[PDB]
Amino acid sequence: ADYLTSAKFLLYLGHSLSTWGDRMWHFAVSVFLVELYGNSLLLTAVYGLVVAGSVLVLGAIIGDWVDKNARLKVAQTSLVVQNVSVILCGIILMMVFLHKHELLTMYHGWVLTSCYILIITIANIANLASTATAITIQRDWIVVVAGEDRSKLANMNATIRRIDQLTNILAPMAVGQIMTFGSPVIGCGFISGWNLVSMCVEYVLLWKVYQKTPALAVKSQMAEPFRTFRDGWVSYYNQPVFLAGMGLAFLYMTVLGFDCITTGYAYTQGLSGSILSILMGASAITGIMGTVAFTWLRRKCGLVRTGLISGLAQLSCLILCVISVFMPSVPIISVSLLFAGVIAARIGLWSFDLTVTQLLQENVIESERGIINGVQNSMNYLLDLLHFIMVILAPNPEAFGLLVLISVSFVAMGHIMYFRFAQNTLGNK
């Protein structure tokens, strides 16, 4: 059973533990946001805005720093900074949850504002570190370990996304179960301890996987941040894969979510918790099946053809969504159609995203991958920021139809731009 010691499985374990810690972290942040502060749209809105803006402005420099330094060093640097930030913030959660009642009651004033600024800043640092580590490990290490065998690379990406989805659906359940059985303070203590132990394990694990893959080793004073930012963006514009990334960034502006807890608008309206649980489970299962579908389609049709098929599937499913919303309380039929539509739009979106990830990992000169992926994430979060602004501009329940129409339109635009890329790079169907 040498598969247990092969760098493949070791890397899957590393990504799995990192994602598990991150998902516990995000669920705990949401529990803080809701238990202390009421279900207020603007708190979550400003949280998302701060995170998205910081990653937007820092993606190019993060990618440049990833590319310039050694893969090993940047890998554990990002890992350690992420884990220390999450541990410190888990300690802060311990203190605040142990002070929930009297913070709400005895001493009003700026204490809530101070704790919320601290939570958002440390969460933003943690998410920046998560973006850095995701870029470096996924892109560079996956492409190098997979080598020139592109089927193995596709399997790598697909199984990574499956692990991501299974974590996203299980970790919130585990954190909720333990927190209910104990107390929020116990939940936060457990999360902090688990992040610590996972930090140690993943440090050792990255050291191990580095050994087994020798190919990784071969590889105003603020003027230089702007020069690097401009150089990275212009390099990304010249990259022939620009259209696919642009369309993916468009696809990340959809309002039909049910993806995670930090990003959601059904809860913004106020839907019941059981329905959200069922929708999240269906979305996770459908995303896993979508990864399977992308694996199956890449072998039969071309990679660009696979992306195009995913695009048509996703677009037609959102056509089903817009038919559902356009139909004349509300009948159960319309809501059921909208729910099935978002669930199958999920499979379309994930097949498309795996395809675009494959293109990005494939068509880079390998001297520039970090910067290209960093600006890719910056664009993704830029259109996520516009998504957040659009949500902010329409709190009213009597705007959901317009919001859905806008999201479908932007999805269509993204797939049209990917279609332009397909025409450019094939000229054959």
Added chain:
Amino acid sequence: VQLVESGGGLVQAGGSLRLSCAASGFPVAWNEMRWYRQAPGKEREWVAAIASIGVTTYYADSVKGRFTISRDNAKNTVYLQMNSLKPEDTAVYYCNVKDYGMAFWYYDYWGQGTQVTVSA
């Protein structure tokens, strides 16, 4: 997200009466609302149920038919119309919400309670 209900009191047996639950922080069309009875000397019992998504009711077996429940999204409230009130109906009514919260973090929220008594 505190909720308040009013309209309790005393009516002759076999009469009719109407409790009105007014809710503020949460929708009363996207969350399962139910009613419970708190009779003296015994623990609480289930009255009726409105589903979260559809307008379908799940009245209790013992009191089925003779109770009616209806939600109103415009006024942001839910109603119970009572008919043919019997002496065993004397109890304290609790307006509640089940399964409100996160995708995987949700609770049950309760009202202050109103006294409804039946005399013969």
